[PDB]
Amino acid sequence: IEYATRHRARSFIPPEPGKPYFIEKGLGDRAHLFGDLITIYAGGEQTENTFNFFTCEGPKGEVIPAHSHADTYEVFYITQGAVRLFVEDLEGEQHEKLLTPGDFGFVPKNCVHAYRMERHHSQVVGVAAGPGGTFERFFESLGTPAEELGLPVRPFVPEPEKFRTVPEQYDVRFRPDHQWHTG
Amino acid sequence: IEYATRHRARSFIPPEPGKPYFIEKGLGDRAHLFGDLITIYAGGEQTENTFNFFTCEGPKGEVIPAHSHADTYEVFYITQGAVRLFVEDLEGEQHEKLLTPGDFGFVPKNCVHAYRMERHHSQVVGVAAGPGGTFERFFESLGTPAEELGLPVRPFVPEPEKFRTVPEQYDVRFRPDHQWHTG
Numbered sequence: 236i237e238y239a240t241r242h243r244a245r246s247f248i249p250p251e252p253g254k255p256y257f258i259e260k261g262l263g264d265r266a267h268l269f270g271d272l273i274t275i276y277a278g279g280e281q282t283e284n285t286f287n288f289f290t291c292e293g294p295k296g297e298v299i300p301a302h303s304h305a306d307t308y309e310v311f312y313i314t315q316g317a318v319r320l321f322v323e324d325l326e327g328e329q330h331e332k333l334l335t336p337g338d339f340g341f342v343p344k345n346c347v348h349a350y351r352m353e354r355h356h357s358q359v360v361g362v363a364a365g366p367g368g369t370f371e372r373f374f375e376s377l378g379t380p381a382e383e384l385g386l387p388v389r390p391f392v393p394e395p396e397k398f399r400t401v402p403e404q405y406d407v408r409f410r411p412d413h414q415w416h417t418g
Numbered sequence: 419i420e421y422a423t424r425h426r427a428r429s430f431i432p433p434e435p436g437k438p439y440f441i442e443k444g445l446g447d448r449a450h451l452f453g454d455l456i457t458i459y460a461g462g463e464q465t466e467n468t469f470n471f472f473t474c475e476g477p478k479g480e481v482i483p484a485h486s487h488a489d490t491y492e493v494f495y496i497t498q499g500a501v502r503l504f505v506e507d508l509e510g511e512q513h514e515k516l517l518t519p520g521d522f523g524f525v526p527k528n529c530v531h532a533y534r535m536e537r538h539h540s541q542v543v544g545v546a547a548g549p550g551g552t553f554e555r556f557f558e559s560l561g562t563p564a565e566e567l568g569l570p571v572r573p574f575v576p577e578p579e580k581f582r583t584v585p586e587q588y589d590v591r592f593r594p595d596h597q598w599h600t601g
């Protein structure tokens with residue numbers, strides 16, 4: 236049931252748009268980025284570039300790098316574990332909430348955010364899209380695509396140069412110095 | 419905190435875009451259609467009409483009426499129970515798969531589809547959008563908005579005049595003529 240695409244020599248996402256398809260649990264296109272596994276079930280080529288659908292799952296760990304997107308809206312829908320989401324609104328106040336499976340978090344464009352996984356193997360459902368396309372392939376770009384199944388045994392830490400060549404390709408703006416005012 | 423919006427007197431989706439928000443499990447805008455509960459956590463007003471985010475849960479039931487979307491792509495991502503997805507491709511080849519939690523189904527536009535829920539209280543995470551915009555307010559339109567939590571105690575059966583008016587507003591082609599071979 237395997238295809239070959241511009242993204243993977245082995246994929247369960249067909250290369251031709253307008254094709255119905257199913258993908259079993261965990262078999263979307265995969266990518267590592269630090270301790271986490273990102274799995275892509277649908278990309279821009281599936282939806283005339285209107286949206287995507289992916290999951291992000293990883294071990295108990297520290298708050299990911301603060302960042303924003305300018306033309307992209309994000310969804311955080313927890314399916315496993317517990318994840319803490321940090322958002323900063325346009326005015327400037329910062330809110331956090333431990334999101335348990337079934338809970339939902341929305342981060343609008345130009346809003347600074349970050350998430351922390353507070354249970355082992357937590358999992359988040361994600362959508363990331365907007366006016367100027369979908370940004371699913373960001374993860375395998377900054378990080379690495381992976382043929383392995385499961386969590387990375389060891390974090391994939393990108394060499395620092397990736398943090399420049401990529402942000403000007405994937406609508407993402409890191410804020411290496413950021414604060415979080417709530418604990 | 420509850421807001422008033424153009425869709426609900428009481429809602430956890432803010433009325434104004436650019437505002438980040440959290441919603442607790444089950445507390446999105448709710449709708450009933452047949453025996454199914456649809457819960458909206460994000461609509462077009464949140465993402466500049468690019469995408470939405472909703473869940474669909476219901477009792478073990480019959481196959482929903484077969485239908486198609488001219489300009490809308492559908493995600494089926496199963497979170498509870500098990501859901502059998504029926505799709506017909508553009509070339510007339512029908513396809514059937516039982517989707518268990520973590521499995522993913524994709525229905526591209528113009529593809530005739532229908533789902534059957536095969537465990538009590540199965541749950542599907544959906545996204546329905548395309549070039550034309552987002553689809554979410556369809557369910558409360560064909561069916562009804564709902565203030566209660568939990569599954570409809572008894573199914574909401576829309577008037578046949580709703581079956582005529584709604585497609586003129588939402589992007590749904592009902593197919594009472596369609597036969598599913600696969601089985």
Ligand SMILES: O=c1c(O)c(-c2ccc(O)c(O)c2)oc2cc(O)cc(O)c12
Pocket residue numbers: 268269291299300302309310311312359360361362363407
């Ligand atoms: O930029 C990032 C981003 O957008 C997401 C993300 C994850 C899950 C979602 O559901 C979502 O909408 C977004 O994760 C990240 C994880 C990192 O380690 C580093 C990042 O830069 C991002």
Ligand SMILES: O=c1c(O)c(-c2ccc(O)c(O)c2)oc2cc(O)cc(O)c12
Pocket residue numbers: 451452454474482483485492493494495542543544545546590
């Ligand atoms: O047209 C319909 C539709 O699209 C969906 C749906 C459900 C879950 C999803 O995840 C999704 O993307 C779509 O349900 C329906 C249920 C009905 O009783 C009648 C319908 O006409 C639809």
Ligand code: NI
Pocket residue numbers: 302303304309348
């Ligand atoms: Ni982000």
Ligand code: NI
Pocket residue numbers: 485486487492531
């Ligand atoms: Ni449909």
